[PDB]
Amino acid sequence: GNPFQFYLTRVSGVKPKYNSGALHIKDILSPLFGTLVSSAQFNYCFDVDWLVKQYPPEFRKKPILLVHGDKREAKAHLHAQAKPYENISLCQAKLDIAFGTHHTKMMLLLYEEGLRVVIHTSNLIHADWHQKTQGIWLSPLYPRIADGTHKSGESPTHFKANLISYLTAYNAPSLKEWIDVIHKHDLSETNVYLIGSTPGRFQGSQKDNWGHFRLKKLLKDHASSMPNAESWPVVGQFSSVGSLGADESKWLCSEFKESMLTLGKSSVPLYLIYPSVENVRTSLEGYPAGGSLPYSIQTAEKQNWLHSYFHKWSAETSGRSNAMPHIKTYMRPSPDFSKIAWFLVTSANLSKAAWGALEKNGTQLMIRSYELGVLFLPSALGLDSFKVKQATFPVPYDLPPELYGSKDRPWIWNIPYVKAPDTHGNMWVPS
Amino acid sequence: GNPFQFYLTRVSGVKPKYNSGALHIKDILSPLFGTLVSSAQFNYCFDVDWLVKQYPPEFRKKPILLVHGDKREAKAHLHAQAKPYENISLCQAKLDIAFGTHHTKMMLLLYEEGLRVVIHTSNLIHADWHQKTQGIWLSPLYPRIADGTHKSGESPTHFKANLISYLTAYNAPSLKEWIDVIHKHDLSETNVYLIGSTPGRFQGSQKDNWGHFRLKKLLKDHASSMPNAESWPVVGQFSSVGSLGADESKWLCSEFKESMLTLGKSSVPLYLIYPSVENVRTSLEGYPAGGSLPYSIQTAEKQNWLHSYFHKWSAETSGRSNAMPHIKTYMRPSPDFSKIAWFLVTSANLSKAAWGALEKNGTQLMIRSYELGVLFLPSALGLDSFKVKQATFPVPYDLPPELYGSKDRPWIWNIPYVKAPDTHGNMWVPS
DNA sequence: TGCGCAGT
DNA sequence: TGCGCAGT
């Protein structure tokens, strides 16, 4: 019981001092953490054979529910993958808005001794846990509420109700079982706030339930303004970039940064962290790290204005400068970067699909995707701010963020790079 | 028989030396120009009572066809206006693409002694012929082809066929009669090229039939490149402005200026002439000239980039600096403005609706509106260029065009101007 | 799939 | 009305 329960995944090919205190998926599903009865795996991509092999032998026949958003042929492929294992069910989360994804990454782990909730950033495929920087939040072991005891099991941060609303929004019968399981467990120790996105169009007070308006509300109610508030940068850090509009006022600096700079009841610097071509080239994977950084040329050339916000991936602090980011984080550092007002780890990349965007003249928040993250607020630990670990929050990358040099360019996955070979002597030719 | 047959309308309140050689509608429908049998009036707005009173008493019972594009209630109002006059029919030109207008202004004037075609810029309402600068082209009197003579009646410029294709595109039975009438007349003297727009989506070689691609083709085939071609500005001059896109490369400088700078088989300066607020304020009409310059704030604030092309209305040359422009013109002056490579007078304002814009990756030219204009090419008079009248072409405004001062702003019809009174002591409050 | 857009 | 748009 350190306060944050924030971990990185294990990286192959770094010194083992950068992997001590890091978690592989195998560690997470270990018998150490409890005697497993069943599980639910919420994700975007699955390699089903690999996933089963991550569970310990004693636990491989226990019911697994996969919660995915694939349709049609993808769906049929995933069903086919799952066919060999009788213990495995599937739940297709409904995606009624186009270009939506079931992007949330979460494990519900039901044990004989209680319940664990893991919220993280990694797809259920080998490459996502191999040589990338990913983030993980581990809930405590939530004990079961005794049969005749009447308690809510709720925390000051309202995690239990907030999780249940997130699950309730799917409308899925196989998730009813998980909702009932959460109901019977005591989640009162939880010291983080849940930030979910769910697909839809939301009006009035429901705008606050999801996406970046949910973050805004949490910050309004549970953080407080700082003297010189103006000067506390916002830092966003992500692996995919959506179509953000013709200029910054369309969404980024207008409705996204607004929500993010809220504190209690604008020239706030915005630093955006996204790997350069050069970062990808010299990575542990080389150019094929690029396959998980899907910023397409067509999107990029609409929005060249964006790339002057862009800063290098740099992670000397966690030995992970060459372990390309699939983690997404957002945070509110002080101007000197020695402390932070809050920290969010989430599945949500820098997209309107993920965070939400306003339609019909401000009356309506549209969200295409399922997302999930956890907000770390000083107030939930009786503090005003966290010191950055150089009590103190473990920021996985270096501060302050360093601006792309003038020869740098963002990684764009679907053009060739044939001038300089990568780490493994290779070029990149999408095809 | 001066070569151009290009006239301005009569302006009330200027010295009569600026109205000698100018034409009122009454002059155009005069018995002087022939003994009228019937007529067709192509236009956008009609005041039917006023129009009938423009025809001489002897000619008021002769068949008039009105060719309009009104639907629904507008249509019913125009039908009601026309009700009292048994000699008057109507033809509704089909407008299958939204935000299209039947904007063409043309009179077909059938006489006992032959046929006249008038192509011009004025709506058939009193205010359009009162104190505005408008343009008129008068065809010669085309004699009838004798019954057993076999001649085409065509000109070197292909006017007759080109007019007939324009009329044929309406698909209107009441226009069949006019097509047959044009067929029986000799139009061989015509020394101008017809430039039409008609509504639709046009592919392949049909892209060249209409709008700005029609202008491009004419310029390719019948003008020739100039030494220093690069440096001959393009001048556009209009009374309405459409939505041209988020920046200049979207249409204006990409496909519109391209068509306009074509000469035979880019840093070409583009000068756009459009009345400032100050031009409208001190006009003969004052702020109500604004009612015919319908550039709305919503369109303007999307495209502030445009307004650095904007130049004042100035017309000392024709005594018409205070007679606000409803004429539209485009032309190709030399760098010193002493001569021009060509001149176009037309109904088409600075809009994609009018000129056309490419859809589906360059394969398709979409046009919303009916338009019509006449192109004056030196080659059709055996010349290489026209000297500007200061043989020589009568440019109705001053050269070179003068840039908006830094306190000037474009006229925008639907915001208030309440700081400085106009010519008649009034303010402007749309409402 | 449904939003936002487009005249004189 | 029909075009262009929008994910990881």
Numbering used by the authors:
A (entry chain A), B (entry chain A): 161 to 425, 433 to 557, 568 to 608
Study authors write:
The DNA repair enzyme tyrosyl-DNA phosphodiesterase 1 (Tdp1) removes 3′-blocking lesions and then protects 3′ ends from further degradation during DNA repair. Tdp1 hydrolyses the 3′-phosphotyrosine linkage between Top1 and DNA, releasing Top1 and preventing DSBs. To establish how Tdp1 recognises duplex DNA structures, we determined two X-ray crystal structures of Tdp1(Δ148) bound to duplex DNA.
Two different DNA sequences were designed, containing either guanine or thymine at the −2 position, and cytosine or adenine at the −11 position, but being otherwise identical. The Tdp1(Δ148) complexes formed with these oligonucleotides are referred to as −2G or −2T, respectively. The −2G Tdp1(Δ148):DNA complex diffracted X-rays to 2.04 Å, whereas the −2T complex diffracted to 3.18 Å. Although the DNA substrate contained a 3′ guanine (0G), the electron density clearly indicates the 3′ nucleotide is phosphorylated thymine. This represents a Tdp1 product complex. The phosphate oxygens are within hydrogen bonding distance of H263 Hε (2.8 Å), H493 Hε (2.8 Å), K265 NHζ (3.2 Å), K495 NHζ (2.5 Å), N516 NH2 (2.9 Å) and N283 NH2 (3.1 Å). The three nucleotides at the 5′ end of the complementary strand (C, A and C) were not visible in the crystal structure of the −2G Tdp1(Δ148):DNA complex.
